[PDB]
Design a protein around this ligand. Structure first.
Ligand code: 3HE
Lengths: 52, 289, 213, 160
RNA sequence: UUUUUUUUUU
RNA sequence: GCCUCGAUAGCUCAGUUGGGAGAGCGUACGACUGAAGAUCGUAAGGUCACCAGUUCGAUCCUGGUUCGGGGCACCA
RNA sequence: GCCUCGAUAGCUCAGUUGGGAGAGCGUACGACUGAAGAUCGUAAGGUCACCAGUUCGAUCCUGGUUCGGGGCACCA
RNA sequence: UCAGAGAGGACGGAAACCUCUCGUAGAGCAAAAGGGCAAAAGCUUGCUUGAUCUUGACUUUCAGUACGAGUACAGACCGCGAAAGCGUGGCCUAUCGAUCCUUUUAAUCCUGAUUGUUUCAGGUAAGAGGUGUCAGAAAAGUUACCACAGGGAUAACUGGCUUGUGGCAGCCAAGCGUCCAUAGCGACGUUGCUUUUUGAUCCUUCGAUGUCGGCUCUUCCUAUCAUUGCGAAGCAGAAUUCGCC
RNA sequence: ACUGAUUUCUGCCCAGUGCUCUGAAUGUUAAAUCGUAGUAAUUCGAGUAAGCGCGGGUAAACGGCGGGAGUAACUAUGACUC
RNA sequence: ACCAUCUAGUAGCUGGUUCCUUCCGAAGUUUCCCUCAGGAUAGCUGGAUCUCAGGCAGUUAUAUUCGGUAAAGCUAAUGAUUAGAGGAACCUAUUCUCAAACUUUCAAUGGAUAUGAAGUUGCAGUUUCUUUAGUGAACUGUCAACGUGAAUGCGAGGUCCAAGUGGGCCAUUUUUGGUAAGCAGAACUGGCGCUGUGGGAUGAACCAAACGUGGAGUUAAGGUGCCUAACUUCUCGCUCAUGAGACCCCAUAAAAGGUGUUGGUUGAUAUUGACAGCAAUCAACUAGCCCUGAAAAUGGAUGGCGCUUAAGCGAGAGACCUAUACUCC
RNA sequence: GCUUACGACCAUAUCACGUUGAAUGCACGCCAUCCCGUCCGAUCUGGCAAGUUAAGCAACGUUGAGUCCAGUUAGUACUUGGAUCGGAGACGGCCUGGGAAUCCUGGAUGUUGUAAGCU
């Protein structure tokens, strides 16, 4: 009664049934994971620019 | 014996980089000396090349680009005749003068000499260019090449010259002349004397006392130029003053016409004709022997 | 006894050469691959006959040796030991495997079934393709008949179909007889024992003078 | 089942090219990388720090971070029915600028320049669209000194 | 304290 | 029957890529002794079970014949 | 078939992490004895089973090979 | 600058140590294998403790959880270097551990609720003590006296596929057969057939297909022992051998 | 408890496991008790019985009871030896 | 032991689980579990809808890249491995045959990214970051101008709640173990499971084609002597078998033979008359059909009957028949 | 036409042998008081300029080895998709598109940047 039986048979069909969803377009806007020193200077730069 | 350098050897052989085969560039140190942090982007990182040949001292300022280094300033010890000195263009004093010349020349070029005069009184004490006003002093990192970093070596004499001229060269006094490696004490007086060439004058007096013939052999052209052991220090001080007075590069000359002095590569037809002639000559020799 | 050849006839597995991973391999039955007047000069034997294969199978070392013995015996008996040169152009390098099972009554008590069924070395076989040359014989032009009959007798020791042909090439060289004669006249082909070496033009002229071509 | 070490199966992927081992040339370090640029990933075996995972070898990514000697890259990776924009910190030695984006930027520059020139000079607006190669047009072929050569199938010859 | 043997016929 | 193993001098045993047939007992002679026994030395003992083959070359390697010796051989 | 264990003078057995190859009997020599045996004094002796590797050096440590020995081999 | 090679030098030899040439790495890098590396990642040597303190982000496995391992930064204090620089363990890919409990280190910390002091106890943060069945119960047998829920997901008998093994039949001829390959055989090789052997498998049957042999009784197949009709012999005949219908 | 009429016999082993016999035995041992420190909880130390460990007995208690080489005047075998 | 009660004891296991239509419609795979007849987890699926009205795609093009498999190589390294030659080993140049854990070289299929308004040019400000430095990097502005930049197709996106499943099996191609297996294990895709329909006599998977309920027409695969709707239709050959042969999977056949017959290849001789006997012939090959090789058990299978200038084998031609398919109503 | 310093690509640049080398320069070179480092001023370090292109280095030469490029190999090997395609099978061709690599043959033998200088 062997019961390991790995396979990848019906997996691409399942993956494609609802389409392969590509990543969104706003993912490049976030400044997450960027250098802390650069981020600090960006905060300082943004906190001081006069509006008018 | 089995031939080591056979067809397979040459087929599998990989040559080193040209400047490594020529034994001129140490790429391990070059990578750490010329590569700029990627968060500084294209901002040039300036390097002070010091190279002493058998008869000349070369000091240059450069920064690296993807197609070759860009030399921005250069001072050669063979330019010192313009400022007095005619002989001894390789000793400690000449090296220091060349460094000073480079520093003053480039500072004048970029219009910072007035702001940064550097240390204008030779005392031998360690000096670092303190920031004045808003513009920080020009900065360069020393590049000694394949030379050995020993105490009192002339590469650090050139570095000292540049630093006193007023360029920020990150350094410590450990490898300057007069620094006792044992007690970690620095003798500014000894360093000043070496910069002024007192060691050369001392050698002149010592040889004069010991043997006149050896003295003439050693310092033949010094005497021919009239530099004895009682005006050399004054000559070096005058050289320093002249450099600090004027440092602009010498004017260029006109392009003299040039002619071919070497042999030109043979053409394909010429090579084939030589092959035919050699074949005929060899056949004739075979038949006549 | 040996398993019938039909059990290892066709090429089914990847090549399994004897190496640091396949140890304890018994020796191949066939050892001699050049027979007859093997030291004859290149010009001695100008005619060449090949035995090509028409099957993509395994030729066993036993079959190779049997065919060698048959062809050698016939050729020696009908032409003399110095009238021919026979070369076997196939060496047995592939290792076949066997998963030995006990064949007596009550064997199932100890039998492991298919559990851990990886086999152990059994013998050496030569992987052969369509158009591959199995045997070659270089002989004089007045012995092609004997060579062909020898290969005809030998083909009955191999499984499947074999085709005997004659070659336009000079002996064991790679030059068709006409061009071989012409080039040898021009001195572009220097004897190399059984075969010949082409003497390309390029090189130092000091070497060229030793044989102007 | 296979082991799951980082460098399983990379025997040739992470190896140097034939007669290309040794010192890494410095243009690799002189190249300029800015956030938003596209880079190809190709692991250099000679550098074991900041190595990309084998899954990202040969992929293109967009830089989102620029540190002292490395860059953060957003690389698409397919996981079942979604594509994940993974973020990886790769050193400069394993990176190379991608020419696909630069070609497009050059084409955009050319388009803008052509439009500006036409508008300034009063010419009609030009066509600035790539078009698939159309079928060949009509033409005449001359046989002068090019007479047709009659071909026939060749007989079978026994090439022993 | 220990101290076994000595071919056949003559 | 099958897996095998072995066959060497009157008897018992070694031996080899395969490139010589050795040792012992036994037999004949000599030495020794008054004469023997024992002991020594010499001479010695062979188609390498038989046949065919492979090898430049087989006692040894492959196949077959004979002779034997050890094991294996429904079933529920 | 599986799991172990061992291989060392001519025979039977020790031996060290890895830097020694030992013990008894056997063999050879001298002595005591009329002679042998016992006895006394000496000597020489092993394929460390075969290989490859590991470290400075391996009989020993590791792996494989050859031989031998032991245990298991059960339902129905 | 290695491995190695060549040529030299008292004792010195194939091998001790010295010298010169050549030497693309054929060496070494703790270990398996694979990558990588030559003014180094190897060898020699100086100084050292970045194998330290802190939080986030990310990669690998992946559910895009956790551990482990790793990557690139940021803040601190440091080491080496003249400096640029490099350093958060080992050149890279394995070398390891939850909850509860115990224990240690940390704050001039919080709590013990009748008010306080001191012990004592409990907390917050970071480590260690270990689960190798390694996402982590605390664990010896026998049953033929046996029981229950099921299983043809799974063995023992039949049947099925296969045919290694068993059995049977061919092809070439090296030899045997006094001579003579084929009367009769036929080695070394090689092609097949059969399911009366034994294996392999696990397809059907475990809410049951009565599981050896013999006795009895039918029918069938021939791969023919006898008998009918024949052909061939190493067929002069009891006899015998081969083959055919 | 084992054996199992009569007859004739009942060999060797107390290492193992049991059972049993002595105990001077500070070897190991609980509670209680005693002493030290402390303002007290409490801490530390000393004692500390039987057992166990040491010693003896016992198999008609459970049980157990070997290998390898050489060797006799034909061979064979091996009384004999290592 | 028996009697009553706790007790409707627990069961990851077996059995059952009751009306009709309509619409949508799976999985046998990942990870963890004393886990392997079970769960949780992700995936696949349904429902509710909500926000909007061009950016997407199991497809191409352009541009740029990744790889070390097939082939190739060993007269290129490593490892095998035959034979000589030129100066017993050794050196030199060669040579025969090779590698899942060898490689200089290296495809086809394949993978990835980009292809404009979320853009391009400037102007004019911020920064404690960076630089010797407006030097850069980045950001900000109701800043100004420009105006959609490959093909084809097409509306797009978001959230929540939850079922069943977590035994698979088959086939072309690739592929590991095994002598093989209707055996065991994998990769891509398509199927059966869940699925009928025409054909293959019959059959889960084969070929065609997917389905409301009817009709007319036309077909796919398959066929047209009779079973049986559709021709003993038309043309040229080959084949005689004392049970020939007869249509994917597919329902077995080989090595080896034939002076049966039909075509071809090569080499010869022949009219200065070729072979046989006292006007073409000879020899060796080759490949179509036929024949031998070809033995099994209840009586039996091109599906059956039968068929022989076929109703067999091969190349073809007209027409014709027939689906739940296509067109139209 | 050159030399030097620093390079970029990293053999079309390497390797072997040989010829030539104006001027700058590079180099070899002389000395070892001093700094500095060694068993050793050989290397490294320092002070110099008598001498030499001998070597390094540069240019050139060679039917040179290697490397690089191209042709051929060849529409070959291999391969995507199709067939109620041929064949007992192994396999083979056809339709539809992609499409190599050795041997062999021919050619090339560094290009170029910044700075300074010679001519
Ligand atoms: C750290 C390790 C484990 C720990 C302890 O046994 C584990 C616990 C775990 C749990 O949740 N309940 C328990 O009853 C046991 C302990 O004292 C030692 C064995 C060492």
């Amino acid at each position: 009664a062997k019961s390991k039986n790995h396979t990848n048979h019906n997996q691409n069909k399942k993956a494609h049934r609802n389409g392969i969803t590509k990543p969104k377009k706003h993912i490049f806007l976030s400044m997450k994971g960027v250098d802390a020193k650069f981020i600090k200077n960006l905060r300082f730069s943004r906190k001081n620019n006069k509006r008018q | 014996v089995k031939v080591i350098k056979n067809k397979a050897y040459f087929k599998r052989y990989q040559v080193k980089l040209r400047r490594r085969r020529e034994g001129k560039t140490d790429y391990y140190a070059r990578k750490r000396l010329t590569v700029q942090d990627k968060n500084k982007y294209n901002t040039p990182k300036y390097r002070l090349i010091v190279r002493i040949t058998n008869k000349d001292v070369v000091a240059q300022l450069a920064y690296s680009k993807i197609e070759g280094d860009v030399v921005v300033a250069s001072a050669y010890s063979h330019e010192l005749p313009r400022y007095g000195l005619k002989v001894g263009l390789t000793n400690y004093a000449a090296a220091y003068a060349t460094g000073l010349l480079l520093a003053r020349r480039h500072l004048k070029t970029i219009g910072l000499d007035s702001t940064y005069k550097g240390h204008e009184e030779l005392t031998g004490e360690d000096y670092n260019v303190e920031e004045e006003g808003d513009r920080a002093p020009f900065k360069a990192v020393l590049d000694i090449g394949l030379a050995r970093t020993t105490t009192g070596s002339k590469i650090f004499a050139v570095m000292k010259g540049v630093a006193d001229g007023g360029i920020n060269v990150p350094h410590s006094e450990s490898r300057f002349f007069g620094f006792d490696q044992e007690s970690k004490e620095y003798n500014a007086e000894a360093h000043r004397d070496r910069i002024l060439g007192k060691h050369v004058a001392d050698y002149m007096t010592y040889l004069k006392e010991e043997d006149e013939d050896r003295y003439k052999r050693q310092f033949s052209k010094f005497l021919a130029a009239g530099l004895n052991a009682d005006n050399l220090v004054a000559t070096y001080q005058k050289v320093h003053s002249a450099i600090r007075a004027d440092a602009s590069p010498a004017a260029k000359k006109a392009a003299k016409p040039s002619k071919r002095h070497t042999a030109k590569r043979l053409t394909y037809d010429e090579r084939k004709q030589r092959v035919a002639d050699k074949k005929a000559l060899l056949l004739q020799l075979k038949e006549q022997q | 006894g040996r398993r019938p050849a039909r059990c290892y006839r066709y090429i089914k597995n990847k090549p399994y050469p004897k190496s640091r991973f396949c140890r304890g391999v018994p020796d191949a039955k066939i050892r001699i691959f050049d027979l007859g007047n093997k030291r004859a000069n290149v010009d001695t034997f100008p005619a060449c006959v090949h035995m090509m294969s028409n099957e993509r199978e395994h030729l066993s070392s036993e079959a190779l040796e049997a065919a060698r013995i048959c062809a050698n015996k016939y050729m020696v008996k009908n032409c003399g030991k110095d009238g021919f040169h026979l070369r076997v152009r196939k060496h047995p390098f592939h290792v076949t495997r066997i998963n030995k099972m006990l064949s007596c009554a009550g064997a199932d008590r100890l039998q492991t079934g298919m559990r851990g069924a990886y086999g152990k070395p059994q013998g050496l076989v030569a992987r052969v393709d369509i158009g591959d040359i199995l045997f070659s014989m270089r002989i004089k032009e007045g012995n092609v008949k004997h060579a062909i009959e020898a290969f005809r007798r030998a083909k009955f020791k191999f499984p499947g179909r074999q085709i005997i042909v004659s070659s336009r090439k000079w002996g064991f060289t790679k030059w068709d007889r006409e061009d071989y004669e012409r080039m040898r006249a021009e001195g572009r082909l220097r004897s190399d024992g059984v075969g010949v070496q082409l003497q390309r033009e390029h090189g130092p002229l000091t070497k060229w003078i030793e044989n102007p071509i | 089942t296979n082991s799951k070490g980082l460098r399983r199966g990379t025997r040739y992927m992470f190896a140097r090219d034939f007669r290309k081992h040794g010192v890494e040339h410095l243009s690799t370090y002189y190249t300029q990388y800015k956030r938003g640029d596209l880079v190809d990933i190709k692991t250099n075996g000679a550098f074991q720090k900041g190595m990309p995972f084998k899954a990202y070898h040969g992929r293109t990514g967009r830089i989102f971070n620029v540190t002292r000697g490395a860059v953060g890259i957003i690389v698409n990776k397919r996981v079942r029915g979604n594509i994940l924009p993974k973020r990886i910190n790769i050193r400069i030695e394993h990176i190379k600028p991608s020419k696909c984006r630069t070609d497009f930027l050059n084409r955009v520059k050319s388009n803008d320049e052509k439009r500006k020139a036409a508008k300034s000079a009063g010419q009609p607006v030009p066509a600035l669209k790539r078009l698939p190669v159309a079928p060949r047009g009509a033409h005449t072929v001359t046989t002068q000194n090019n007479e047709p050569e009659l071909l026939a199938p060749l007989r079978f010859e026994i090439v022993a």
